[PDB]
Design a protein around this ligand. Sequence first.
Ligand SMILES: [Mg+2]
Ligand SMILES: [Mg+2]
Ligand SMILES: [Mg+2]
Ligand SMILES: [Mg+2]
Ligand SMILES: [Mg+2]
Ligand SMILES: [Mg+2]
Ligand SMILES: [Mg+2]
Ligand SMILES: [Mg+2]
Ligand SMILES: [Mg+2]
Ligand SMILES: [Mg+2]
Ligand SMILES: [Mg+2]
Ligand SMILES: [Mg+2]
Ligand SMILES: [Mg+2]
Ligand SMILES: [Mg+2]
Ligand SMILES: [Mg+2]
Ligand SMILES: [Mg+2]
Ligand SMILES: [Mg+2]
Lengths: 154, 324, 138, 119, 177
Amino acid sequence: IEVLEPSVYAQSYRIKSSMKKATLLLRLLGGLDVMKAISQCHFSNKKIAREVAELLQKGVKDGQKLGLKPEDLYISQIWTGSDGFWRKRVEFKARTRIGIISHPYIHVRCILRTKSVTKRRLAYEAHLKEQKRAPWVQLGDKPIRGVTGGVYKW
Amino acid sequence: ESELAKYKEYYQGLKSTVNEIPESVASKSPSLRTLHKRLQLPNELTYSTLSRCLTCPSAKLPDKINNPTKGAAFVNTVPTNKYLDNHGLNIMGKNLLSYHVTKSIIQKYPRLPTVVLNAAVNAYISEAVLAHIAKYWGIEVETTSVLSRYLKMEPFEFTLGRLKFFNNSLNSKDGIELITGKNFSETSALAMSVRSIIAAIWAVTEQKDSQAVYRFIDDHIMSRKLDITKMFQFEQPTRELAMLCRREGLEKPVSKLVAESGRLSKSPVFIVHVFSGEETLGEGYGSSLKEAKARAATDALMKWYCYEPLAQQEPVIDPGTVVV
Amino acid sequence: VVKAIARNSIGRNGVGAFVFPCRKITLQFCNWGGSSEGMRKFLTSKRLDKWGQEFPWIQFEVMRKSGHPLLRAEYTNGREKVICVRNLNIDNVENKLKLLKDSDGDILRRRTKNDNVESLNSSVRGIWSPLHAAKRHR
Amino acid sequence: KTDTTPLKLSNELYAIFKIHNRPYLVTEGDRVILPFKLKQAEVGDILNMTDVTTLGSRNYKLVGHPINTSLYTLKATVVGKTKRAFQTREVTKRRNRRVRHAKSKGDLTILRISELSMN
Amino acid sequence: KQFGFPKTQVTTIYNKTKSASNYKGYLKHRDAPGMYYQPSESIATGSVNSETIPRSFMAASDPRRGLDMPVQSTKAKQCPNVLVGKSTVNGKTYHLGPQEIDEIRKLRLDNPQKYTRKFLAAKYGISPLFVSMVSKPSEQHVQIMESRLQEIQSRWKEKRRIAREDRKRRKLLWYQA
RNA sequence: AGUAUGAAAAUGAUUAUUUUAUAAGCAAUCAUGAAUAUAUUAUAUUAUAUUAAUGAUGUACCUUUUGUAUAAUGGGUCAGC
RNA sequence: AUAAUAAUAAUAUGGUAAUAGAACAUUUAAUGAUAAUAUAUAUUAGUUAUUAAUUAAUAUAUGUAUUAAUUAAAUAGAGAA
Ligand SMILES: [Mg+2]
Ligand SMILES: [Mg+2]
Ligand SMILES: [Mg+2]
Ligand SMILES: [Mg+2]
Ligand SMILES: [Mg+2]
Ligand SMILES: [Mg+2]
Ligand SMILES: [Mg+2]
Ligand SMILES: [Mg+2]
Ligand SMILES: [Mg+2]
Ligand SMILES: [Mg+2]
Ligand SMILES: [Mg+2]
Ligand SMILES: [Mg+2]
Ligand SMILES: [Mg+2]
Ligand SMILES: [Mg+2]
Ligand SMILES: [Mg+2]
Ligand SMILES: [Mg+2]
Ligand SMILES: [Mg+2]
């Protein structure tokens, strides 16, 4: 039921940053509507923001091409990973000390779902759980924990 | 030789055996013999009748066989003779089961309400409980295709010892469940096998041991656990209790307080008794005075409705459900 | 008024008629492989006939497969117990047959201390109530 | 001399019976798990309790050491003989590489109470 | 006293005050053989047991009727009334004929706001429940009250709502017994 | 430093279930509520699986030593050798 | 006069350095049917007194085991340098 719901898979390119630096921005764009997460990336001061904004626009266009409506889309899962093949270089310090400098390259991948299907389903499920939950009985039938022991104490 | 001809002979032979159900081949089925005396069926119950219990009225193939593209295929069943079938047995089984359970519940709980009794009778002989009983006993549903049995060269005795009815192969495949009638449901087929067994155990032993099938029913059906207390749900117990007290000679009921603790607290305790005079009819607790009064009224009603007389008492006939 | 809460009865095997837990035993083997020499000699011996006569509410199979020997036991509840009988002699295969036969099909479990009685019935004497106590506390 | 009518006239009854001096408190159709393998009793055989210590109802009791076997009828049926779950524990010392395993798989005997009534 | 059995109680060789839950004490207690009257230290709200059914509730030809099991420990003379109505403490009264009843109905349909249950109850010396029995308000009065109720229920936040449904399930549990 | 495949682990982000903002120590074992998920014999008053309610017990591993939690030596982790 | 299994009575079954007996995993060599309704590997849930092998489901490769079993050999088992 999760996979069959409408979704758009947006992948970035090999961008020069670190997976820590990107996470600072991506944690903001958690469940935000794409049509507004784009504006936030536009006005962010982080270099990573510009490329994330372009990715969201492509996803919105991608969803618009599959049949979905741009105002119906919202980021459901945004994350990042190591692109691989990081170049390692040796840092030369003063008194014969050596360091290794790595140059991380990462990619940011998004998943956008439709708020007219996924969110409604989740809201429906939450309602069922609320109904299914048991009441609170002040003198509740709390189980008598402990093995009886072959003796009738009452 | 053309192998199609060999299948012709196998198919005709299987159809003939089902149409006749001879005892010579029915007695060669290990499933039948084991199923026979696992339940201690009388020695006078021929293994052919056991097969007849398992057989079902699969007379003519339906119009859904035409295409399985619509989610329905019936290849595991062979047409059966109309005379040899469980169609008449399950009616007897249903009649016996309904009568005994209703009679036995009433005898144990005379004052039961009609609606509660119908629920209790349903619980004992529901379609689900009977289906579960059949599976417990080991009755198997023939799921392999008739062709498949030919290649494997299965003797007819095995197929003759299984539950045979129109089976919707491709039922739950890929999640597409085509909805059919009760005639194409494994649950219904199994239940009527149990009813059919109840009928046969009667017909054979009705002449010499009248109270035999009923003993069998009390061994397997009414030996099951059921708490009548959990089948009740009152709405206005106070008014209904007052009507009961007026109807009988009992005095007008008044609910009074016995003990309390933590009145000004989150979870107090109140004990109230419904006094029909000096005597108390019901005991009730709760975290509120209103809750205790309701609990006490329900207890008194439950005690009246669930009274169980001793087996040595003269039979007691309830004056009927209270009408408000 | 009175409404009914529908329920279903609970199977209590033994109180009325006792239905034996095991329903079917399968004796699989292989015609090639030293792992099944014990099962072969068991099937050729006169012991399997004795087991059929003594326990005729159990259905016995013998099957040939290109693999290890086995012993499948289907029980009433629905589960199945399978035993590998590689490199075992006649008496050990018989003993494993004895274990499968005389066992309910229940999944093996861990039991606490003194947890020995499981009843689905209510209490003859009701749960202890501080208000309705033998002697009041203090 | 031993009055029993109050226990005759009861909708439910309970018994405290001992097998090898281990007390078990049971009712009609209760299940007992004896923590040993009964070699003398075969699966499906019916036992007859004859060491019942206490028999009682909601407000009454009958205690004996043991109660006379003619005053009641308690029978239990063997339903199955199974084993506990497999547990293995390592037994080792503080600075010892060698570790020994103490495998445990207990034997149980399932019993179901068939009849329990006064006589 | 139908039976003269010695009276006992759940006893432990230890101190019950500090060792109530110690099962060994009850294991190691031995009582002399015979019969014992050991009362149950519990309530009987949902107990069908034959030893808690009231005497008046069993058949006339019941042997257990003579036996005094359901002891009348509590006396009515000292237990105060709980949520009892005025018509219960003071006997029911039947003093209205058709003429007054028609007046009650006509008065209510005329102007329910001024002529309410309490007003009619005080005027004719009858209970508000009775006015429900005989009188029926105008459909407009019910419709505005129902709409008024819905408005009250609308302003609730999530917590109140959940609490109210919680109350509803508790009621079912009370009556289920 | 051949070519294909690659749900091997360490490691990173996100999501899902459960627990967590009045409680203190080798992070586990046992006792025991509650929530959640699966189950084509849950007939259920059902069985498993995950989860830091709460209670009891619990001084990492190896080497060397009469003797180590020792604040005595060796170990960031995983894979191959 | 033996071997396997099961009964009854009795005795014993902590263990460093060390001694003695018996087994399991991986690879190679000799003999060695079967086969996509099978075989190998991995995950999950069961079975067998369980470092192992098995049942079922799922996923990927292969028209396919140096496969079961008896011997003969080891670059034959890693939290410890
Ligand atoms: Mg790569
Ligand atoms: Mg520098
Ligand atoms: Mg670095
Ligand atoms: Mg040492
Ligand atoms: Mg160690
Ligand atoms: Mg103490
Ligand atoms: Mg807190
Ligand atoms: Mg801390
Ligand atoms: Mg030193
Ligand atoms: Mg120390
Ligand atoms: Mg250190
Ligand atoms: Mg330190
Ligand atoms: Mg170090
Ligand atoms: Mg030793
Ligand atoms: Mg090596
Ligand atoms: Mg390693
Ligand atoms: Mg190790």
